[PDB]
């Protein structure tokens, strides 16, 4: 279950998530747009899903993309803040899962964000250990898809 | 105009928003659920829109309501964090406006959350001065609906 996936997150994993978030979560606009542009650059097949945002190649200049990117970072902020209470983490994870289920995003497709997260983390010198920690958090959402 | 509305957030209004947010934003789960249950109690006619959440009268015991409520508080956190830059505040406001436009929520009905905000603020000893500052922030979203 989602609860199982959440209850699994260990103290060391939570520590790595919080430590790396202190940095990448400190510039939500910059890193949020970086995540999205990287997704589109490495997984061009996903561009079609974001047609509401207009021309995503405009990057920061695209107000719809910018608004979406900043908001995406607050979803991550939400997750990070609920780490110590699996019950609360689960209910917010399911809320966002619905936002994606209605758009026909499968668990496998949702996992495509792992690549961009790994690259953004690396840009701030957070290595594989941190990328693996984030993949575990993403997997909690995947358990709901 | 959402831009003219954003211009109404003067230095004093911004300070009052930040000062009161430091308190109500400290318990997102508690105060978020309080806002929603107050909305449903004072404005029964809005309950129909929240069909997906199930039995909202269960309050905190309702997992979907709790997930929704916590997330709503992160939308407010988002707005407060964008007060320094109007172009960024506007793009996040328009993102959430779309979330409501698709739900057929008008500016007038969106404004019904002012009552709940005033009550929740008052319960923490923040009076009309603060309620009015928050009404101006809500007015920015209303301009986009
Ligand atoms: C770290 C992972 C991710 C998080 C935290 C996340 C978060 C969000 C949030 C908060 C929204 C706004 C929901 C709404 O207001 O309706 C959103 C929308 C969306 N997401 Fe994600 N997302 C993630 C990964 C993905 C991936 C990898 C895909 C696709 C392969 C995807 C596809 C979409 C689509 C199509 C939308 C709707 C955009 C729109 O039309 O406004 N998401 N996401
Ligand atoms: C301070 C004011 C408000 C804020 C910041 C706010 C924020 C939010 C957020 C963040 C969501 C989730 C968006 C999504 O994932 O699609 C949401 C959903 C929703 N909001 Fe609001 N909202 C506010 C006031 C209102 C009011 C007063 C109404 C109705 C009279 C309303 C009706 C809705 C509905 C129907 C949903 C969809 C719930 C669902 O099915 O999940 N909102 N709101």
UniProtKB/Swiss-Prot annotation, chains A, B:
Keyword Acetylation: no
Taxonomic superkingdom: Eukaryota
Record InterPro entries: Globin, Globin-like_OT, Globin-like_sf, Globin/Proto, Mb-like_M
GO molecular-function terms, A-Z: heme binding; identical protein binding; metal ion binding; oxygen binding; oxygen carrier activity
Domain (Globin) ranges: 8-145
Annotated keywords: Cytoplasm, Heme, Iron, Metal-binding, Oxygen transport, Transport
Gene3D superfamilies according to UniProt: Globins (1.10.490.10)
Localization per record: Cytoplasm
Binding residues annotated for heme b, in chain numbering: 100
Any one of the GO CC terms: cytoplasm
Quaternary structure and interacting proteins, as annotated: Homodimer.
Family the entry assigns: Belongs to the globin family.
Name of this chain's protein: Globin-1
Organism listed in the record: Anadara inaequivalvis
């Amino acid at each position: 279950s989602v609860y199982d996936a959440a209850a699994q997150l260990t103290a060391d994993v939570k520590k790595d998530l919080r430590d790396s978030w202190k940095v990448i979560g400190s510039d939500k606009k910059g890193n949020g747009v970086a995540l999205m542009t990287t997704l589109f650059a490495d997984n061009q097949e996903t561009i079609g899903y974001f047609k509401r945002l207009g021309n995503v190649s405009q990057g920061m200049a695209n107000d719809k993309l910018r608004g979406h990117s900043i908001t995406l970072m607050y979803a991550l902020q939400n997750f990070i803040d609920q780490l110590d209470n699996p019950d609360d983490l689960v209910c917010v994870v399911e809320k966002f899962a619905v936002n994606h289920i209605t758009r026909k995003i499968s668990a496998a497709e949702f996992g495509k964000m792992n690549g961009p997260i790994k690259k953004v983390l690396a840009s701030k010198n957070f290595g594989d250990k941190y990328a693996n920690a984030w993949a575990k958090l993403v997997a909690v959402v995947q358990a709901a898809l």
